[model samples]
Target: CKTGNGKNYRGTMSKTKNGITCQKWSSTSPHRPRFSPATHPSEGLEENYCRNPDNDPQGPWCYTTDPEKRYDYCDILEC
Candidate 1:
């Protein structure tokens, strides 16, 4: 579980962001992009900010005080 920059950090608690992120709440982002009605709703609408390109193990993980919903997700996991 210890990985990345070793900051003991948890991104799941935060939000996801793409290359072109704004100062807003949605972590919506993309390569080509969806500028209208915001970017990928999956960006912030789901947990773990959706899996990254190579982080397979992290695809279905998230942190939360509510044990009922933490990591128990889909959409983003499907992303």
Candidate 2:
């Protein structure tokens, strides 16, 4: 499947393009994300799944567990 915004993507990719693990959406460590189940319940902010809560044109992304890396895009496939 192909997705630009990936708002409908329900994949389980939990790492950034840099190989950094994604932080839990419910977590506030490393980085405090603006998107969450409480903030965007329909965005599918489940566990550490890659999601596009902001409808980013680059597709799914998430806050990294790396304290130095705030956020980055995910490696979602296109077809």
Candidate 3:
């Protein structure tokens, strides 16, 4: 979970025998917010990196090709 500029962002990646699933949520305000498993991958990784429109209507979803680069940064508040 990461808080940024007074907003909170939380995300998670889970692995199953079938494959991996990634989820994320952004706060509506300063307090803890609600979390919804990414309905689509685009909503998860805001950056335009992942691209799977057929399987990810809400995403540009990523598929492990690069784990290190994928889960490295979180936009957090300075203070």
Candidate 4:
């Protein structure tokens, strides 16, 4: 799992490493990213959970609620 860039991660972590709340994949508030439910239907973009929908090498991440910080990595561990 560590080598897959969290592509197989299905955890429910919803905050970034900085404790910033993650934006819902379906919502386009402060950050309107390209990895929405419509864009990545099979990437498990559910709720405000952090995920590696785009196969980011940094592992699971999500759009943050902060307007300044668009996105950041989550606390998902390699297991």
Candidate of highest TM-score: 2
- Candidate order by lDDT, decreasing, is 4, 2, 3, 1
* Candidate 3 lDDT for residue 33: 26
lDDT of 2 at 29: 52
Put down candidate 4 lDDT per residue, 1-79, tens digits, no spaces. 2224535543336766555677776545546465654454246566676765666555566776566866776655556
Candidate 3 residues lying further than 4 Å off, grouped into runs, are: 1-49, 65-79
lDDT (tens digit, per residue) of candidate 3 on 1-79: 1232123433323321123342232333432124334563334333222233225323233433233323222222222
lDDT of 2: 0.57
lDDT of 2 at 54: 62
| Backbone N/Cα/C clashes per model | 0, 0, 3, 0
TM-score of each: 0.21, 0.62, 0.19, 0.60
Model 1 earns a TM-score of 0.21
Better of 1 and 3 by TM-score: 1
lDDT score for residue 47 of model 3: 28
**Highest lDDT against the true fold, candidate:** 4
Against the true structure, what is every candidate's RMSD? 13.8, 3.6, 14.8, 3.7
lDDT of each: 0.28, 0.57, 0.30, 0.59
Which regions in candidate 4 have their CA more than 4 angstroms from the true location? 1-11, 26-29, 37-42
Candidate 4 clash figure, as a count: 0
Q: lDDT per residue, candidate 1, 1-79, as tens digits? A: 2132222334334333211121222232311222224332223323223233223444422232232322321222122
Lowest summed-lDDT stretch of 10 residues in model 3?
Answer: 70-79
